A paper describes a structure:
Boron, essential for plant growth, necessitates precise regulation due to its potential toxicity. This regulation is achieved by borate transporters (BORs), which are homologous to the SLC4 family. The Arabidopsis thaliana Bor1 (AtBor1) transporter from clade I undergoes slow regulation through degradation and translational suppression, but its potential for fast regulation via direct activity modulation was unclear. Our findings show that AtBor1 is regulated by two distinct mechanisms: an autoinhibitory domain at the carboxyl terminus obstructs the substrate pathway via conserved salt bridges, and phosphorylation of Thr410 allows interaction with a positively charged pocket at the cytosolic face, essential for borate transport.
Full-length AtBor1 was overexpressed in Saccharomyces cerevisiae, purified in phosphatidylcholine lipid nanodiscs, and the structure determined at 2.3 Å using cryo-EM. Particle expansion, 3D classification, and local refinement of one protomer improved the resolution to 2.15 Å, allowing the unambiguous building of an atomic model with robust side chain densities, doughnut-shaped aromatic rings, and water molecules in the cryo-EM density map. Our 2.15 Å structure of the wild-type transporter is solved in the inward-autoinhibited (IAI) conformation and reveals previously unknown detail, including C-terminal (Ct) domain swapping within the AtBor1 dimer. Importantly, we were able to resolve the Ct domain and construct the model up to residue 645. This revealed that the Ct domain comprises two α helices (H11 and H12) connected by a loop, followed by a rigid hairpin that deeply inserts into the cytosolic cavity of the neighboring protomer in a domain-swapped manner to block the permeation pathway like a “plug”. Therefore, we define our full-length AtBor1 structure as the IAI conformation. Specifically, Arg637, Glu641, Arg643 and His644 on the Ct hairpin form salt bridges with Glu502 on TM12, Arg153 on TM5, Glu604 on LH10-H11 and Glu323 on H5, respectively. Interestingly, Arg639 on the Ct hairpin does not form direct polar interactions with surrounding residues, but its guanidinium group forms a polar interaction with a nearby water molecule, which, in turn, forms a polar interaction with Arg153 on TM5.
Author numbering:
A (entry chain B): 624 to 645
B (entry chain A): 5 to 276, 281 to 373, 457 to 630
Write the structure that this text describes.
Amino acid sequence: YPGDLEILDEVMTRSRGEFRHT
Amino acid sequence: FVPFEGIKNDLKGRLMCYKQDWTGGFKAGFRILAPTTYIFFASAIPVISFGEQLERSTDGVLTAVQTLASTAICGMIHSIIGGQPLLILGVAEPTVIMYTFMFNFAKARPELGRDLFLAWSGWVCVWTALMLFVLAICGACSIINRFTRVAGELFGLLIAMLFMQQAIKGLVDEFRIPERENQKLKEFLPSWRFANGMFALVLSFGLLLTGLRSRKARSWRYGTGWLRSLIADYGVPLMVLVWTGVSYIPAGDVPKGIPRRLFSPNPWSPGATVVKEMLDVPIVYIIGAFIPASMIAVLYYFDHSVASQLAQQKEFNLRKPSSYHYDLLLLGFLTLMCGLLGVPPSNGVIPQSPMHTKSLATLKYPVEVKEQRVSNLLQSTMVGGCVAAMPILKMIPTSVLWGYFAFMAIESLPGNQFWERILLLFTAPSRRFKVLEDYHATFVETVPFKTIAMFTLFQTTYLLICFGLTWIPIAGVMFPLMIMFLIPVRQYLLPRFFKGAHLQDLDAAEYEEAPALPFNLAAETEIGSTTSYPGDLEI
């Protein structure tokens, strides 16, 4: 299963670190 | 807006968790070093790049020594007595631009010259500190909820444009003779200059492409988990090291300065407070320093607050309170100190602060953040120690740093909804179903395309006007005012032209996303109602 940083990599924008709401 | 009320509440809240803020960091053991090293590398490389930019722009008065020293001292002080330790401080590009404007102004006036630039900058910093004190005391941080997306993303794209412009300027300059160098060296013959320029292109593009690729390592299917995480976390410094090593390959057969390496001097070499020179500045210019001081104060009031907000997103499930007012007050004090010491001021930086919070997070299978002061203190101390290691850092070719500038510009884009809307504006009308076939912003489905187009055209015109303003020799220092005016514009003018829910969708506080739709569902939509069928060669 994916690690914490692997998961957080997908839900946070790279430009500004904003959480994505889907 | 009761004076001192916000500061008092912040201090009362943060004084109840100080000792825990330290012991929790101590209780983490040696595992606190991984986030510390990650954030240290995220902080150091851009600050060195900005130091080189200043070295070029101030004729050597300010270099990477000063930017690193400012970052380190401000970070250490903020870690010890700051309100929100998750916030990372550093010298940023808007500060570099403002200082470049100030140096250009000072160099052209006989009364100031290059010998009083740092004294006049000290006065500018004094004015800025006073303005930030007033803003913090009067509770101006209560209205930071009005710093909406329209301003933040426009500012981000403007900084991205400036980054790319700097990369281009540096790469162009690699082909020329530097201003303050012995022009008779073999390094500067036309043949060797052409060779240096082409080698710089190779190195910068290698750095950029490899660094961009490394960012997605955690989603690869090769290697081990720890190796993938290592690449994803330290790709940038690793690629900087790799391309430095590459640059040393032809060292045996080329002149000394091929390729060109960092221009910042070594502080250890015998050749090497501005208060004494501050009293030598004429009174007229002491008063006139109020003009750039207000713009710098506006910049810091915006950026510090936004960085802290990003670091404190509610999805992090943080348990300790915020300190916006007190942190603005401390930033004022730090700006005063930096001005008195002859270094540019530091402020909260993006995306370093949210990335710090993320690096401190774990999922309890549900985000839990280890909030303490040790990580910030240690990373600031390491940034300070980079000053002693300047001889090692002087081995980095400048082209690698120009590539890093391009990297920062391109990395400004991925989560920027303004950039997404520009790309959508350039999309062929019959190919928008392709936009609906992947993850996309919700306004793409909930807002008519005409409204999106008008909103984007207005924003793009504003951005281009600001970028052009930065090119005007003297008035360019007013661009933070252009940024600030977007707040009242959004609050009062936009509602007249745009309708309610559409403005809310296009300027949402949270990042709203929708999953990919099936083709049969991407065709019923208004935006995807003009689906042209593919050709034979497309099949």
